[model samples]
Target chain A: ETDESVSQYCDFQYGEDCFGVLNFALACATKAIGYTKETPKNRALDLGCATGRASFELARSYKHVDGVDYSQAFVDAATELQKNGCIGYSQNGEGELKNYKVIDREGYAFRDSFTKVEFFQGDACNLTPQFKEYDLIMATNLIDRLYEPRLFLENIHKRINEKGYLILTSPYTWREEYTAKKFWIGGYVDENGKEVSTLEGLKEILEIHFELVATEDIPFVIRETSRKFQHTISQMSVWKVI
Target chain B: NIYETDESVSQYCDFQYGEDCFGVLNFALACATKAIGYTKETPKNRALDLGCATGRASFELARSYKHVDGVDYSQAFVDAATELQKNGCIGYSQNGEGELKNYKVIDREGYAFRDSFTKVEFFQGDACNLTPQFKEYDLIMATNLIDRLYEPRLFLENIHKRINEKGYLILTSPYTWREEYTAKKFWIGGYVDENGKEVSTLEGLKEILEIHFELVATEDIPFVIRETSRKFQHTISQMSVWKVI
Candidate 1:
């Protein structure tokens, strides 16, 4: 088991729906790319890539992929699996529950994919200068958790190549815990008694350098414990660099 | 058990047994427990706390009922209650104003290793599809659970079979159903009708519950869930008390 703070993502990255969501995101991006003049399937950047599943998944199509996560523990686990083939988690192994309680070790083994993927621990708001010229940039369920969502959105357009696609997926649950109320992109009523939604917030920022191509609702599940599960539907926003 | 997480155990401990921040309010567990007042005609032999989170109601009911059982879907929650049954207190830290934290180990003086406390037991199980061993209770109490379930009708329609004849069934919910938790088709109310009539959860309850139970009383109970020192979720739930037909 990983650290308590990073334990959830360690298991979630290997979740059934974790691998399922990318198909929904990439398919949406693929359809939008068909309309664009140049859809280069070369370099891909996956931001907020917990455990780097997308980074490895994208490697099947793209030549090279970079997986960036805020937590070093996640990056190490993903990188470890990239090098080593197996990762195990100790779940429900407590002996105090019953005299016969089994200390179980459940885990997954990732098959050797294209070895061109690299995992990096980097803050989404600020990335190194060399992380540029990507044909596709995918950020799934990333923006809402970002402390500086505006900074990431304002600058992400610079990384994508011309006519390239950018896919972002989120349920848009903006609260004061991860982001300050003032820094929230949307989902709050204003002083004038009107509401500002997250979609509108993205439009004000992304429309400058990108064209809003299409939006699709994708449902995913997070199986935390055997009995506890969180099922949510996130809106996948597909954008093309203008 | 994510439900067994220290954070949740502490939260339920604070919510059920901890002293209120202000002295004006009663503990929610006590409020819900007292709401089930009965006359001499009713028996206090057995009681079931069907969505019992941390077992405060089970202990509370044990004061009068000869035997009380707490059942819930979360194993972690049932563990917390069972721990309290074996031990005297459960210590936990409450989230403060983001600075220094306040830690507390608390025990209810009324339930201090006495006969009432000893009469309570807990188990982990689902309310919609409970085990056969969970039947034949004189009273069943499910508080603020229906709207959060995947199938509200399945539980409500079949709940009467678990209670003995002339027993009692109590339920409390804000009826705040959402498509995220429960599918729209299973929702009790909160929809428009063909004749433009507004549907209420009370009407929906009568439609399903009237078959095996008689509506004895209905009242509103307020509960306060403190998330932090600076903020709390203050909400009201409508409690419906029914007598088995």
Candidate 2:
């Protein structure tokens, strides 16, 4: 399941209100990870790009961006908008009434950067061999939803270039329905009879291949409706590959 | 000030655990943590949370520091924060449509403010004329409070004496300048200068703080206030960190 309603996530990715927070978080994370300070432009992979708001944003700094998503619908929408540079959708204003919006990439002032972006429908756990050697990789709200989180974590090091960075952001809301209890990394006790945290699980898997650089709790607000909204904090962890 | 007893402000204080509030405060803390080089063994032991409003910054500060003092001019604000500290919970109403209200209880468990939270003391004190007893802090945090003060320059100039040498001063504000809160003559920035140059608040802060402090970092922290069920006030406050010498 895409989890969010089609139109709901659509507007969220391209909406004006959401961009302020989204772009701000990206800017902060990019700066913190030294993405902005690096010499020359680099390549980045945005996993679970969900509508590619961040992919387009990364294009502003990176020379090229590969935005991957599991949902065909999400990929189709992003690809269409990226190619055409415009899409018309209805924004839920409050109740029964909806506001029709024509989102133009030109208005975003990122049309030049769009040329360097590529969108694809792909799974996070089993990415192809061709998708490797990225200078930077970002997974936003993707880990808990993946069927094989361990597979993804154990193999992610191969995809990143040496001295590159990996950024993962998630609320870590693990539910048995989305992932089996056994597959759950955190939010549950361990076989040693001790409580194992998500961060601890991450450290165990990541320390061999990468060094943890920073961890921050960043927030994102989704407007389910004007009156009804969902507010969640995504723990942003940045790691540098050894 | 609305923070004194406004019901909306009270509800907002309770909703500090929510995404919008946590986002802004977390970003500010991340900046401060990075700038001050806080670690478990090398943590900043003393902190001053100026204009703490509902005490979110104080709670965040407590996680890293041994003691935190939350200061605000409004007694009502101080009382509400003290209530949260003592009782670990507070209930407030969210404005619904047409006289309707939705009650919500903000608890320590929900926001991660546990029993292990750092020791925090709430005080009702004026920012412009702080008490002489408040001095020598390792970290001083003033969030969204600068533009609200009547004389921000007076506070900025005098703050150096209160902070220890090489201590950090973290200040955040949207720069929503108004004559009601600050006199035009006393404004640090946000107006045409006598020579017609655009004077930004950061420049004004530099003018006042450069002699006693060094600018370390600046970040934009975005915050959203749910004014009503449908309306929201989205603001991007600029957070600047200074190292006092």
In angstroms and one decimal each, the interface RMSD of every candidate reads 16.5, 15.7
Clash pairs, model 2 backbone = none
Q: By DockQ thresholds, what CAPRI class is model 2?
A: incorrect
True contacts kept of 1: 0.00
Give me the iRMSD of candidate 1, please.
16.5
TM-score of every model? 0.51, 0.50
Model 1, A1-242: lDDT tens digits are 35543545544555334323444334433443443336667888888877666677677667788889888888887777677665544331111010111111123222444387899999879889888999988888888798989889999989999988788888776667888877777776667875677777888899999889888776554533332334456778888889
After best superposition, candidate 1 residue B212: deviation in angstroms?
0.6
Worst 10 residues of 1 chain B by lDDT: B21-30
Candidate 2 local lDDT, A1-242, one digit each (tens):
35245566667666755534564335433553364245334778899887677788788788888999998888877887899887776564422234567778887756768888999999989998889878888888888888879989999999988888888887776666678878877766667876666778889998999999888877566665443345555678888889
- Which regions of candidate 2 fall more than 4 Å away from where they truly are? A1-4, A18-33, A95-97, B1-245
Chain A TM-score of candidate 1 vs. true chain A: 0.83
In terms of lDDT, the poorest run of 10 residues in model 2 chain B is B34-43
Candidate with maximal lDDT: 2
Tens-place lDDT per residue, model 2, B84-145, is 77777766666532233456666766665475454899999987888888887888888878
